[PDB]
């Protein structure tokens, strides 16, 4: 509880200089992010598609670039955000695949977020060590939504924070 709508937290906080102390720390937080919050959540595909289109379209971020195949990479990202890819078609996340992966999640304060990311995928002189897949992010406010696309973008790779 306690709604405060100061998004991403990052709200000023006080420790005060009020006694053996002349100053102290006033701080705003940072360090308060999304990837964690949302839990995986699920859907019927036809309805899904319909829905996918239907949803708050308004955010997307791109996937392109990493350190891994989207097998290990995808798993890693998935676990990191604690979120769902709804369903496979065996077409094949292996030989290429030339697979677009649909992901859904529902959070602790209940937003459902929808993705279709469509991605190249690693494999010798076939394709995938980048993507150039587009991550399409729908979350109700664009501001969190895009931000989520980012957040995930942060999540995507593994490097010096």
């Amino acid at each position: 509880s306690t709604e405060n709508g100061i998004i991403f937290g990052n709200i000023v906080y006080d420790v005060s200089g009020a006694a053996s102390d002349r100053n102290c720390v006033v701080l705003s937080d940072i360090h308060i992010d999304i990837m964690d919050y949302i839990q995986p959540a699920t859907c019927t595909d036809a309805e899904f598609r319909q829905m996918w289109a239907e949803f708050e379209w308004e955010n997307k971020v791109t996937v392109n670039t990493n350190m891994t195949d989207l097998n290990d990479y995808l798993q890693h990202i998935l676990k990191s955000t604690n979120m769902k890819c709804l369903t496979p078609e065996k077409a094949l996340s292996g030989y290429c695949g030339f697979m677009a992966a649909n992901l859904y999640a529902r959070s602790i304060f209940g937003e459902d977020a929808l993705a279709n990311v469509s991605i190249e995928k690693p494999v010798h002189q076939g394709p995938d060590a980048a993507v150039t897949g587009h991550i399409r992010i729908r979350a109700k406010s664009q501001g969190m939504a895009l931000s989520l696309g980012d957040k995930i973008n942060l999540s995507q790779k593994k490097t010096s924070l």
Binding site: V12, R22, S28
Partner: protein, 281 residues
């Protein structure tokens, strides 16, 4: 390098920057007093001190507190931090421009925009000082070099410099040679705001918007109710010191010294801030 935050609003007569904090406390004549402890781009509080206008802002001198003045005519000191009112007296027939805090017996000075300013004992109850020598409507009231020596700027077209006492105003002296306040080539006029020859300096320049002091010094840097903002040094007292500070188009509401910077910053009304030296000027 960066102008971190910027929205044009507020119609601002009185102003102060936190010598300790990156606060700006701002007085509008919207009737508003505001403290924003400017750092986190956030206002702590905002009280429109009364229905009438607000001209004054001054420091208590401590760390984070305001002493405030409105057309209420009241000296309030309220601590933002402690969100409470320290000791209270209202004001005469005009608002409070400057304040200083002292403490033999935790003791107090209040500087005012009207008539008198009175300095009060709430401990071993006696009189430290009485200041008469103001009339109405003080634009910029000031502590001097000696902090508890002072200057005031008026819409009564005078300037007052006063001498105080621990039992009201007086000074004892007998050694000097000539004076720069008044004693050789050039010098600017007395005004009338009080009635003792300390120096009441002429605040006529259609009236004086601001007065600013030179710490050990008596040079003043001024805002004036003339295009002419006229600069005088009473640590010299030049001729072509009958300087009118000139825009292109009208005014020079103020022009000011920056403690550190040996410079003058001018600001005016053709849509402008005008840039001035004062190191070689």
């Amino acid at each position: 390098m960066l102008t971190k935050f910027e929205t044009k609003s507020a119609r601002v007569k009185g102003l102060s920057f936190h010598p300790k904090r990156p606060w700006i406390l701002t007085s509008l004549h919207n009737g508003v007093i505001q403290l924003w402890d400017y750092r986190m781009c956030t206002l702590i509080d905002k009280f429109d001190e009364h229905d009438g206008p607000v001209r004054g802002i001054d420091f208590h001198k401590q760390q984070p507190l305001f002493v405030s003045g409105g057309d209420d005519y009241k000296i309030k000191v309220w601590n933002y931090k402690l969100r409470r009112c320290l000791f209270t007296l209202l004001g005469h027939l005009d608002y409070i421009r400057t304040t200083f805090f002292h403490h033999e017996y935790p003791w107090i000075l209040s500087a005012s925009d009207d008539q008198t300013i009175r300095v009060w004992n709430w401990q071993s109850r006696t009189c430290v000082c009485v200041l008469t020598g103001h009339n109405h409507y003080v634009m910029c009231a000031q502590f001097h070099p000696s902090e508890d020596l002072v200057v005031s700027a008026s819409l009564d077209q005078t300037v007052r410099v006063w001498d105080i006492s621990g039992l009201r105003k007086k000074n004892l002296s007998p050694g000097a040679v000539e004076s720069d306040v008044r004693g050789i080539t050039g010098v600017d006029l007395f005004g009338t705001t009080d009635a003792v020859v300390k120096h009441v300096l002429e605040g006529h320049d259609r009236g004086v918007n601001w007065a600013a002091f030179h710490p050990t010094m008596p040079l003043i840097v001024s805002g004036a109710d003339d295009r002419q903002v006229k600069i005088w040094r009473m640590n010299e007292s030049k001729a072509w010191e009958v300087d009118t500070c000139r825009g292109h188009y009208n005014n020079v509401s103020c022009a000011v010294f920056h403690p550190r910077q040996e410079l003058i910053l001018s600001n005016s009304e053709d849509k402008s801030i005008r840039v001035w030296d004062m190191s070689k000027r």
